[PDB]
Symmetry: D3
Subunit: 175 residues, 6 copies
């Protein structure tokens, strides 16, 4: 059973579900909107080998980022052109990891699903590379797996980026 | 709780869930198959800036469309070659928006999830760029976010393109 | 309602849900981890036309596979370079189909969703091209639709690749 | 989860729950009202030994019955008194069995609870003295076990007597047997 | 699905379920305890004909009432006996109506079942003789139908008398009417 | 949602619901049958004041008991009459407490309702006169409150007497206490 607006308000009120920060205006019919943080990670190894520790760089943006499809073949001129034309602070191609602003904690009787915002899906911008279910008992911010699949997309710091859908478990989990 | 075949039939019969047009042969064990419309939208701005109104063109196909991966680098000869060889009316690379034929209306106690057809997923054709949950209270056709990730894929007007999975809400929503 | 750890154990114990092979250590709070088989399929036609029978080749790996993004433009030297450097048995670009090791059977009152592992989503490796719901009554292994979206990714035979999330149906289905 | 009005109507429409006769105005917010049949059974035995087939009398009322508490000590004179004064067809004391007019069939994913109606409970008249849950798979009319606990109560043929409350099962039941024809 | 303590508290906090007065220490694992009011009704009629408005007496106890089984045959001498010996304000036999102190309102997605408390059931005292389900949408106090089935039982003003068990409906109910003002 | 047979078996197998002794043939479509113990309690007090520990007698039947309605006025001669004629070990009138043979433990996500069996209800014999819901977290045998409302009824040691109906809670309950050892 998916929690309605009224249920989300109740579980937040009683601290069954922690959402920090919380804005009641982000509660929809059956979801909670989450927002985009200013910190991103970009990987800088040649391949991804999960048996190893991954090398990465951390980027923080002031206002906005332009996410280009892989193989957009960005040159120095092109990046400056985009910065001047679209007022973006950073221009990336391919995958970039982001984060929600929101920190959540789930109880033992709820699982949540992250999904990217519909308006961004309609411009072929994804912020999750999986169906996005989150274990009962989870604590943390949500890591966003951002990729553009058609043309470059501007993302703004603090914009609504996606939503959490909360489902009841049939029984409490042991975590 | 996900609605079974029998539940979908009941909710359609009593107009709790509106599906127009409806075909009882499209009811599966726990989903309803939806079909591909003949109208598509292609964006024609340089980047996507959601703070602005987006420029687009509307395309209608007679029978079929060939959806090529981004950076397939289509030339005039290549497009004609594909049209002659595969009898497609239109050839696109990268993202294209489509629509279901079906118009739906959801009540305050149901949320639905769109998912693309399995047989199309197995040829790396996606028709949704998000997990695809639809708010309780929604009214409309479903916008399809179509991208091919391996080789070009032929899509046919009116083919089964994906399915709707309907879940009960824990409580009625206020929309 | 999503099945918890305890529910999954119960339904496996009573053979309501078949999972072969089964490892109780793969039961999480509200999911079951599945693993990557050694057999893959690669398509070898020019385009995908689902009205036709598709031509493909079968590949079996000994230990590992390097999955490169589409348009990585692999040459003979580059493939050897990757094999020597990363000890992979096979190097592919674009889409490849895989399989879980696990064979499942779902009863008439359960639907399951496949999702790819979070740690792989964070390196822009996907193993499903759809939301991944599986009909009540399904019998089979799970076909994996593998694509890398950022850099090449090493996948290991038998690694945990994703998870199954099981939901109750509101009523039994007629399949 | 308890079926609402909307659910009851759906399940009756698709023949998932059979109710014969069905009256749509008997659907409440989360229950279905049932009505009192005109046939009743009164046992005639000194003690009830379930190893036996009990002896009984059947009666059919033309319109109404007066049900008196146990030990009301009904003589022919008191019976005619009541019949004359209140125009009842029959006067009984102690337990009387009745039946709903309604015949039901429950699917393998529903259980139902019968309850006697509140307005009769308010005058200490019951039509069941157990909780009243009915197995998934059940097919039949509902047997009513009618007892008055304070003063005699008039009941009328075809009156609403109680309600069925329908609950979803967590999983489909084995209703105890399977039949495969062809 | 039955609401747990956690759920009851949530629904009371947001005013989805109204309970007036509310005592948080009356929330159990999966129910809410209700308490006995000091006003009671005793009918005064030879038979109960629901076509009529029944005649009754209202009483208010200062602290306690002795409820005797039907046919206990209470004379003024036995009444004063009990009053003197057990310090009760009133002695009655047979059925007596009472009320909860608590006023409730149920939303369109909840039904509740009243049950008399176990410790009173253990001495054959009931405060309802039907199953006790209450419609979604209900607003009111709970009417208690009190009967002792073995020996007389002392009840006290404001004591916990029973519990409400709350269940989710599968879908929202049409509570039978809609009101649109502006 | 009410547990089906399939669910009951699962929860007993994993020790989520304890039932001791367990008989798999007592699992019905959506309930578990329980059986009547051979020990009974009869109170010996003029009135029941819950502020006190009530006085009682314990009895153990070798095979069977005749339970008579209240005010059946049992003399030694009538008792031996019944004992001789129906071969019962004990004859009682009015309320008698019994117990299930079965000991249960409920987890924090389940509540159960006891109901007396239908075939006994059909002869106006009850083994509970409240709705019978049991808290999540409960551990124990089930106390039976047995009353016959029409004629005396024979009950036998170890007979099926009623059923437990198990419901999921919407959320886990605080069962009222937490114990942390090490």
């Amino acid at each position: 059973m998916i929690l309605s607006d009224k249920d989300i308000i109740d579980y937040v009120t009683s601290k069954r579900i922690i959402i920090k920060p919380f804005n009641k205006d982000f509660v929809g019919p059956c979801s909670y909107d989450v927002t985009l943080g200013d910190e991103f990670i970009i990987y800088d190894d040649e391949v991804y080998d999960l048996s190893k520790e991954l090398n990465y760089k951390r980027i923080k943006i002031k206002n906005s980022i332009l996410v280009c499809p892989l193989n957009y073949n960005l040159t120095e001129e092109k990046i400056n052109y985009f910065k001047e034309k679209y007022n973006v602070d950073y221009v990336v191609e391919g995958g970039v990891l982001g984060t929600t602003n929101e920190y959540i904690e789930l109880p033992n009787d709820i699982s949540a699903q992250y999904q990217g915002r519909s308006s961004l899906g309609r411009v072929f911008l994804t912020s999750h590379q999986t169906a996005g279910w989150i274990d009962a008992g989870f604590k943390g911010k949500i890591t966003l797996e951002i990729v553009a699949f058609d043309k470059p997309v501007i993302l703004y710091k603090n914009q609504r980026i996606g939503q959490l859908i909360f489902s009841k478990l049939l029984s409490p989990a042991d975590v």
